[PDB]
Design a protein around this ligand. Structure first.
Ligand SMILES: C[S@+](CC[C@H](N)C(=O)[O-])C[C@H]1O[C@@H](n2cnc3c(N)ncnc32)[C@H](O)[C@@H]1O
Ligand SMILES: [Cl-]
Ligand SMILES: [Cl-]
Length: 261
């Protein structure tokens, strides 16, 4: 034994041919079509309302359902191109958005557009948040955690992120949304129970996530049980391996409009 449902999922995923993998990875998931956004942004459209990444749709999914309620000064850790920061800036109660990402050679760089509220956004590349000192904020967002074929690596990278965000959470933001790349190992589930006892919130699987990642979002507006919410997600991803391939559900891409606040 000792294999976790998610660890069993990850092995199977590892044992899957390329062929099994790419019909699996989107089997039955929710998705936005980026074709129009990607073309407009390539051409230089800044006021067409496009999201700079699929990230805006994911945060929209959570905010549309109250899984979190951004407000005040938003900090966006690992902001990449900025999908979460620009989405944050359209929300009425939000007043300031500060995004930080590493950028450079292998890493997404911030994209400058003029979606609604763009003028309260500042994205800063060249920042390794692991060496950034924590600062107060009202809404704490973190979308760091890069996929790996090894679950030991994914655990390691998730633990590293979670230790870092502890210092930010100790400043007591009222709202938060933290990517947990690997929630599925025994160490992670225990760690996550402990964090939830101290800081509240709970885990949510965003259905725009692909079947090839077990990521879940630790959000201030959930009250869910760690073991049940993570195990439920492992069985979901296991069960989409055994059935025949399901179609993708598209939602509309986000229209972030345009204009200053
Ligand atoms: C792919 S994402 C950004 C997704 C974003 N939420 C959106 O909607 O566009 C996570 C980002 O974290 C950056 N990152 C990874 N490690 C980092 C670190 N130690 N410090 C700062 N940024 C990091 C990656 O380059 C990556 O672009
Ligand atoms: Cl990472
Ligand atoms: Cl990452």
């Amino acid at each position: 034994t000792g294999e976790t449902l998610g660890e069993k999922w990850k092995a199977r995923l590892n044992q899957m041919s390329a062929l099994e993998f790419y019909s699996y990875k989107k089997s039955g998931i929710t998705e936005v079509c980026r074709e129009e956004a990607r073309r407009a942004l390539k051409d230089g459209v800044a006021t067409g309302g496009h999201a700079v990444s699929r990230g805006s749709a994911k945060l929209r999914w959570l905010v549309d359902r109250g899984y979190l309620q951004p407000y005040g000064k938003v900090i966006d850790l690992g902001c990449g191109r900025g999908g979460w920061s620009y989405y944050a800036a359209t929300i009425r109660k939000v007043q300031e958005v500060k995004g930080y990402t590493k950028g450079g050679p292998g890493h997404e760089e911030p994209v400058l557009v003029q979606s609604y509220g763009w003028n309260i956004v500042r994205l800063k590349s060249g920042v390794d948040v692991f060496h950034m000192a924590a600062e107060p904020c009202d809404t704490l967002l973190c979308d760091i955690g890069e996929s790996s074929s090894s679950p030991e690596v994914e655990e390691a990278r998730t633990l590293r992120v979670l230790s870092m965000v502890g210092d930010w959470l100790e400043k007591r933001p009222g709202a938060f949304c933290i990517k947990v790349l690997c929630p599925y190992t025994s160490t992670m589930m225990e760690t996550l129970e402990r964090l939830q006892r101290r800081y509240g919130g709970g885990l949510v699987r965003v259905p725009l996530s692909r079947n090839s990642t077990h990521e879940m979002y630790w959000v201030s507006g959930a009250k869910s049980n760690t073991i049940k919410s993570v195990s439920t997600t492992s069985q979901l991803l296991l069960g989409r391996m055994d059935g025949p391939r399901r179609p993708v559900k598209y939602e509309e891409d986000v229209n972030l409009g345009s204009g200053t606040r």
